[PDB]
């Protein structure tokens, strides 16, 4: 298996992209520990990693409401925060919290689960945008300065990818979606959540060591 | 004068780039309401719009100690928070404060003074990067967004630049900062601030309505 | 005059954005030596600066038929070479006939009139669109080496703006033009001629001395 | 079993720049490679690559010239300047063209560019060269998303820093000047093996990566981040 023998800490297993992440990474030999801690709280981070053991990967699987449609004026204070506290301070949190034990061992993978509306103008999602270009800012900032020490960290910008939070069910069914998604999305289709984490478990793998700090598009096309 | 008639607000007059863009933008023909009021408290961006009267530009001028070579390992949670309520939370406070009027005339202009560590790898700067990434991402949002309403928002990404944030003058003085910075800079020397105000004057005037939602790097080549 | 006592070369003066930069330029005290010499033959561009002589800014103005709506099984060789020869390989003749007399100086100007499809995916151009990314790439790969010399070289990259060449007038007057230019602009509108010179203006002046190869969108917030 | 188990791979000049290791990679995972010496500079000579081919499912548009590292802009004169244009774009162009329409027709197919971060960010003293990547960087993003309309993914590998013989042959790399500049501008510190490429190579030549579009991912140690 291509994560024979590696043990992986997936936050917030149960949302967004954890799902699959789990699948796949468990056919490929990982040990998937899935956490569903609450990391917007100081020091639950560090908590669940001394909890989890010995890690080879972190999967840094945030999302919050995108709030789709409400306009700038309609992004009031507590909305805007929410975007930060659900996505942005975590992140810092559980990185921080298991990249010591990376650096002892000179090696180690992060893979932040991210958005293509961190790359490109997303229509209707102000807060949200600016909070993954906040994610995205975080793996280019980190990434170049962890690769000294051997451990990756990247960013999957993914877009039009099905999953509860952005393109749930009853929200892609409707003529109306279908038609916009012909529009923008050059491949014509939505991904599976199973597509995203084969991508995840590239960049979790160590046949990926050589890509830091990257952002890759997962959209179809769209930011292309 | 490039900006003859206008009224320009200006946060943090006092701080990072707001002095050369009082002397430039006045020499232009603006009047510049200077304001020093903290936008960090919740309702005081508000308050000034009211007490500023009509505004046709807004200039975001926010800065926060970059903490230049502070590690991640090093970058607590009290530093990391410093960085968005200083620069992030404060920037849609006053766009989002300014924009009513700019839609009732269906004309305005926002300037944010940013960083091109919102760009690229910055060394030693990961929080201050990360909030940056924010703000770049707040103007890759709302400028298509303003956009459809007549106004500009743009993002100056500089770097190399004279300021007391992140370049003082008793940190490029030394010889081993000259020496770094000729490696780095291809222009091979720092921008003035009169330069910085000169690229905020072209935003800020008519004479750039096209320019949407962009980042104009600002740093004598070095994101190149 | 913002352009005082400055000597300009345009190429191709009578094309593309041409005529805009001799009115803009002229109107700020430049002397603008408007060129009309095909530059796709060897040698002309030395002849074209030798006769010149002092020349302060250089504005590279090249354009060819985009060929809207032709596909990549339709882009045949004729075509691709036609793009490549009439705006990628003129562009290094004249930039290399006008560095040398920067050089003895340490100062000079280039502005590389591009195109956004340089920066993203442009429906039904592929073959124009490879060609301005060429042309993209000199100035990313020329800008931080002429920055040594104190010579800036930068590049626009307009889109949705009025020319013979990409949006004349009976091509934007339709219906259906303006309900596409709406739905993929932010702004909604098309760019003046103008306007285009106005930010070549700055790019020419030294008041932009700091911006080293960079690429500038001028598209009404399309590619943001 | 193989990730590549029943594809057949087209590979051009698959004795150069990063070709021997995808040979040996795709190999492994069960592709059947289709290694092309061709010389693509000539017209006409990428149409007769891909009829005597036969079936294809991925194209690997493998191409190299040297960079002349050093060479300035003075010095780059018209035929430098286009030998790096008539060396690695045109021909991109011409192969691609030439294998779209069986893939067009299946509504199934695969193009991997092996590129260069030279496409993505200054390149220093290799002028001529890094255009004509950025050339090929807009040959994928322009064709990548007209491409998927029809199910096929075009992406673009922006490698620096990555073994082969054209780039960091013994004698570049062996100097204090090479290393120095290297530990200050490459995050990860170390060349990457050809088999690290081809492993990426590999990920966007699969089905595993149906999704990507036109992408540039850079392959560079964290060089242009
Ligand atoms: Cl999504
Ligand atoms: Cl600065
Ligand atoms: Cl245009
Ligand atoms: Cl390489």
New interface residues.
């Given amino acids: 298996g291509r994560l024979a023998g590696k043990r992986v800490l997936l936050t917030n297993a149960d949302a967004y992209m954890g799902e699959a992440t789990v699948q796949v990474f468990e056919e490929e030999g990982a040990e998937v520990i899935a956490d569903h801690t609450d990391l917007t709280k ?1 020091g639950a981070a560090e908590e669940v990693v001394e909890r989890a053991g010995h890690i080879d990967v972190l999967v840094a699987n945030f999302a919050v409401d995108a709030h789709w449609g409400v ?3 309609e ?1 009031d ?1 507590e909305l ?2 929410t975007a ?1 506290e659900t996505i ?2 975590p992140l ?2 559980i ?2 919290a298991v ?2 034990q990376f ?1 002892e061992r000179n090696k180690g993978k992060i893979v932040v689960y991210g958005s293509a ?2 790359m ?8 949200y ?6 994610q ?3 793996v ?9 020490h ?1 451990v990756n960290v990247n960013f999957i910008a993914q877009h039009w ?1 099905q999953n509860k939070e952005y393109f749930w069910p009853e929200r892609i069914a409707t003529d109306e979606f279908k038609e916009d998604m012909a529009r923008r999305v ?3 289709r939505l ?1 599976t959540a199973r ?2 984490a ?2 995840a478990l ?1 960049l979790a793998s160590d ?8 952002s ?6 769209w930011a ?1």
């Fill in positions: 100081v306009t700038v004026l992004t204070e805007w925060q930060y942005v301070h810092h949190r990185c921080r990249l010591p650096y509306a961190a490109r103008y997303t229509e209707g999602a102000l807060a945008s600016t909070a993954r270009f906040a995205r800012g975080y280019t900032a980190l990434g170049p300065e962890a690769a000294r051997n990818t050059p491949l014509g991904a597509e995203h084969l991508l590239f046949e990926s060591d050589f890509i830091v700090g990257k890759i598009e997962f959209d179809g096309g292309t």
